[PDB]
């Protein structure tokens, strides 16, 4: 019969023995449904995903929930297919978990709705679409130095407490009302409070009505944090490949996905790699990130926040994710502490993607002049630390004078930061951004106190703010 029994339990990993010739495939889902037939047991409703063929009719599997209360010898059922989740117009306005079960309390999904398997190969070489158009966001530093590509991948790197979540919510506010197509949010390994808070902001928005959700947060065991991303991706893929829509895809932390992978690779019996990560880190990152692409049928724009474990950018997970992204913004605790938000480090910016076409005449000259000035200031900062500005050359003093202005004008007031500070936020167009930085680079405002440049929108607000300050 197509049923097995538990042989071993080691945290998230379970070993199941089947009959000869009835072994399940490598990604099959398995079910344990146990009624507590005696007061020294508890009842169980657990689902497993197969991972390895161990030899001797035994399979090693990963549990999607807690394994507390499992007993050697329980009966295990093979579903014959990978984890399958509902898709279609039925998912709009709903909140789900890793298994595709709604958790919003609006009722179940019909048993006969269409549901698609979570695992599948990526689109073929001949199906991909390769066209670059800029995605205006309204943030000065991005739209000048790190501009996002419609249909591509975006990476927000940052340490702990630096601004990834606020930046992603300002992007959701600036883009998702206007976007017109479908959208998907996937919360992997982040706060459950933040999932509740986001659901109510969205609800009021009726942006919930199109956009809503899947969640697996830091409370979940590693099995669910390893697969919620694939669930959300499946729901996005249906809209891309079945209706031709342009789809937004937000992922609140994609580093927690590889962290979850490394938390089970050890118990699966695999030798540790550098820094203790799993030996398959790059393969599992690639198999997931290759399915977030744009074909001819539709497009996916994905924005992914990426945690760097300590303030260390050479850590294997961030370093390996760097190869998949069409734009990157790196946030720095140094700027966040100097008071500069969004706190983006302007150099890294995938300044490659920016450069060639769109910006390439007008905006490219301004963007390169900004980066050249901030590079020279960064060269001087070492000697500025010991002796101050008293020993610089008079032409190297002008560099400091204007780099301070440029560095402060790159910061902005966000709509979502109003709830921290009574100041309302601002949306700034690319033309105005280019305009303002051009005048500052020419010297039109070299007399204003540097404080007038902090947390404003257009360059005119700097003038009005200095006038208010009394200059």
């Amino acid at each position: 019969m197509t049923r097995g029994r538990v042989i071993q339990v080691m945290g998230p990993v379970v070993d199941v023995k089947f009959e000869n010739g009835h072994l399940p495939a490598i990604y099959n889902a398995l079910k344990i449904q146990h009624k507590a037939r005696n007061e020294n047991e508890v009842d169980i409703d657990l689902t497993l995903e197969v991972a390895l063929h161990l030899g001797d009719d035994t399979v090693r599997t990963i549990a999607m929930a807690s394994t507390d209360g499992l007993i050697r010898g329980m009966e295990v059922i093979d579903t014959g297919a990978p984890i399958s989740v509902p898709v279609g117009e039925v998912t709009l306005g709903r909140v789900f978990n890793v298994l595709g079960e709604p958790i919003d309390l609006e009722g179940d999904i019909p048993a006969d709705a269409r549901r698609d398997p979570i695992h599948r190969p990526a689109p073929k070489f001949e199906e991909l679409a390769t066209e670059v158009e800029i995605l205006e966001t309204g943030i000065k530093v991005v739209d000048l130095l790190a501009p996002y590509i419609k249909g591509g991948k975006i990476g927000l790197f940052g340490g702990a407490g630096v601004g990834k979540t606020v930046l992603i919510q300002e992007l959701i506010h600036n883009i998702a009302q206007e976007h017109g197509g479908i959208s998907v949010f996937a919360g992997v390994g982040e706060r459950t409070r933040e999932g509740n808070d986001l659901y109510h902001e969205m609800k009021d928005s009726g942006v919930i009505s199109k956009t809503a959700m899947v969640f697996g947060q830091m409370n979940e065991p590693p099995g669910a944090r390893m697969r919620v991303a694939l669930t959300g991706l499946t729901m996005a893929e249906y809209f891309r490949d079945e209706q031709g829509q342009d789809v937004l895809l937000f992922i609140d932390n994609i580093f927690r996905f590889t962290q979850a992978g490394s938390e089970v690779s050890a118990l699966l019996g695999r030798m540790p790699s550098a820094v203790g990560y799993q030996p398959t880190l790059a393969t599992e990152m690639g198999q997931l990130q290759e399915r977030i692409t744009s074909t001819a049928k539709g497009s996916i724009t994905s924005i992914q926040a990426i945690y760097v474990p300590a303030d260390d950018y050479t850590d294997p997970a961030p370093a390996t994710t760097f190869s998949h992204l069409d734009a990157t913004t790196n946030l720095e605790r140094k700027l966040a502490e100097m008071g500069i938000y969004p706190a983006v480090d302007p150099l890294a910016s995938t300044s490659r993607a920016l450069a060639p076409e769109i910006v390439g005449e007008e905006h490219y000259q301004v963007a390169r002049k900004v980066q050249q000035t901030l590079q020279r200031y960064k060269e001087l900062q070492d000697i500025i630390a010991i002796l101050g500005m008293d020993e610089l050359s008079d032409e190297d003093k002008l560099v400091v004078h204007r780099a301070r202005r440029i560095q402060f004008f790159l910061s902005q007031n966000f709509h979502v930061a109003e709830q921290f500070t009574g100041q309302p936020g601002s949306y700034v167009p690319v033309k105005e951004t280019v305009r303002g930085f051009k005048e500052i680079l020419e010297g039109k405002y070299d007399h204003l106190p540097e404080d007038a440049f902090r947390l404003v929108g257009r360059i005119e607000e700097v003038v009005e703010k200095a006038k208010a300050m009394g200059v």
Binding site: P272, G276, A385, I386, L387, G388, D390
Partner: protein, 56 residues
């Protein structure tokens, strides 16, 4: 000129005091980072050694 010479020696005195204080602070933070690097290096090497022995 007597005023100017007095002011020059006071100015150089204040500048070299501030420069020495800044250098001392830099030394302190650099020693902190050096010790962190030293500890991390030792841990990485010992982990590699024991992991190789375990795999063997």
């Amino acid at each position: 000129l007597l005023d100017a010479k007095a002011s020059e020696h006071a100015a150089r005195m204040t500048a070299m005091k501030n420069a020495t204080d800044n250098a001392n602070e830099l030394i302190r933070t650099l020693t902190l980072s050096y010790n962190r690097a030293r500890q991390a290096a030792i841990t990485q090497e010992i982990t590699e050694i024991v992991a190789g022995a375990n795999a063997l």
